[PDB]
Amino acid sequence: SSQAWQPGVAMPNLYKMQRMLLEKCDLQNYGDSATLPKGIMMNVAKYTQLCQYLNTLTLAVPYNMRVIHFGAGSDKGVAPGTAVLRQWLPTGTLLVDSDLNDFVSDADSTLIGDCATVHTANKWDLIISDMYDPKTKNVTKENDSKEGFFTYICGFIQQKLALGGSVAIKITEHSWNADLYKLMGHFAWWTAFVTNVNASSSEAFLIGCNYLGKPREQIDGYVMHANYIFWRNTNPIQLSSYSLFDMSKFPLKLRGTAVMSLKEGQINDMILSLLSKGRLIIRENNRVVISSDVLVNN
Amino acid sequence: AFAVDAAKAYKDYLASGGQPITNCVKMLCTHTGTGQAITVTPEANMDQESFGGASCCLYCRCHIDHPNPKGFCDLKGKYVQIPTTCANDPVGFTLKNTVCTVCGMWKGYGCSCDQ
Numbered sequence A: 001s002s003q004a005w006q007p008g009v010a011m012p013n014l015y016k017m018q019r020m021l022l023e024k025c026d027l028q029n030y031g032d033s034a035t036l037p038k039g040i041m042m043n044v045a046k047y048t049q050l051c052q053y054l055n056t057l058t059l060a061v062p063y064n065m066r067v068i069h070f071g072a073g074s075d076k077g078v079a080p081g082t083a084v085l086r087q088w089l090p091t092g093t094l095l096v097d098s099d100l101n102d103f104v105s106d107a108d109s110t111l112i113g114d115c116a117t118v119h120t121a122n123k124w125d126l127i128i129s130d131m132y133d134p135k136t137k138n139v140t141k142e143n144d145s146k147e148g149f150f151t152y153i154c155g156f157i158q159q160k161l162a163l164g165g166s167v168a169i170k171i172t173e174h175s176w177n178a179d180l181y182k183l184m185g186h187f188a189w190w191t192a193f194v195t196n197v198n199a200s201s202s203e204a205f206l207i208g209c210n211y212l213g214k215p216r217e218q219i220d221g222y223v224m225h226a227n228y229i230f231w232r233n234t235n236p237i238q239l240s241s242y243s244l245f246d247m248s249k250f251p252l253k254l255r256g257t258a259v260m261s262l263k264e265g266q267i268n269d270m271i272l273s274l275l276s277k278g279r280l281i282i283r284e285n286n287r288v289v290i291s292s293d294v295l296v297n298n
Numbered sequence B: 001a002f003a004v005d006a007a008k009a010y011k012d013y014l015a016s017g018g019q020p021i022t023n024c025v026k027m028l029c030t031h032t033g034t035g036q037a038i039t040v041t042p043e044a045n046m047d048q049e050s051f052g053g054a055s056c057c058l059y060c061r062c063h064i065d066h067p068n069p070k071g072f073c074d075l076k077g078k079y080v081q082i083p084t085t086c087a088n089d090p091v092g093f094t095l096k097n098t099v100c101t102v103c104g105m106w107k108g109y110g111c112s113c114d115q
């Protein structure tokens, strides 16, 4: 583990190519903890390592970058992950966050309620989700693909992610969805990323890098989650907070990526290639308008 | 003429020996920053910790209205630097102290315009 000095560990490509069957996840280092810097909370450390890993990918970073963050409230009413995302993102990036429960936030704008009540007019450059329902982690029954908020997330990616944009969506052994894995094949590249501070847990972020709006690759989502569990089961990851102590190169690079508005007939292989290298965003550049549905009754 | 005075209510509860507001969001940073009080990214120096602003605002945290006509919050969406010796009560600190308008440091913990 030269891995201990990385922000985390990504699913190696050879594990993606397997055809494993789903097993129960049994982590060697389950119940260990990393020692966090004094007074630093798990969700700050976790989002910091996630952003540090995203720094190594070909993220498109336009002027007027637009980021939306789902599942951003804590049980203490604040938004630690949102605070890390604002630190990471270029000054002036529009950041909207949301959560079922009320919380106060550093985001430019916040919507409270089930994520299915959230509507936006515009498309987004980067979607981050931390949503998780702890009722799913019941070990006593079959681990099938889950719907709930994952159904919203897949719809939201297909309808509201700009071409070239990227996603990072939290999953676990039991909190996962087969269509979301299938959608990873609609990006130029994908992985499952485990932060070193939370390596004792089956959580990972499914990261889709540079959205292409069409299948580049055909992915069976039940097989790929089985492959992810197999990787985790046979590759213990040493807990580590090492990367948190060097923040000198943390901010996301201002790449000034080009934004163009194109009808879908104009997406040729040359556009696709620019999307694939993080050099192009395709969406409009109008005002960002969002809203929340309110049900009225007595 | 009635207005609820939450700033005074929190200072009074600190005075009687009450536990400060917790779970202010402390950031990872280099601790080689300018040291100014309220900034767009963490700017803590060797003697400071950096916190996400909204989590350090009394009015945000207590879900009450901000005391000015505009209604605006000048911490939300920013980062506030707290002296490490005061970081047990970031809300109390920001409420009780004042930012220098010329150099941007805290009056009394970094402002050097007065000698």
Ligand SMILES: Nc1ncnc2c1ncn2[C@@H]1O[C@H](CSCc2cc(C(=O)O)cc(-c3ccc(O)cc3)c2)[C@@H](O)[C@H]1O
Pocket (backbone or CB within 6 Å): A070, A071, A072, A073, A074, A075, A098, A099, A100, A101, A113, A114, A115, A116, A130, A131, A132, A133, A134, A148, A149
């Ligand atoms: N449909 C939705 N729409 C909008 N937001 C949603 C939706 N679904 C979930 N969220 C939000 O996601 C955010 C992250 S869950 C983090 C988490 C992790 C763990 C763990 O593994 O240790 C345990 C619990 C937990 C334990 C006991 C409880 O009683 C409640 C939670 C919670 C929360 O703030 C949720 O509100």
Ligand SMILES: [Zn+2]
Pocket (backbone or CB within 6 Å): B054, B057, B058, B059, B060, B061, B066, B073, B074, B075, B076
């Ligand atoms: Zn406030």
Ligand SMILES: [Zn+2]
Pocket (backbone or CB within 6 Å): B100, B101, B102, B103, B104, B105, B111, B112, B113
């Ligand atoms: Zn001064």
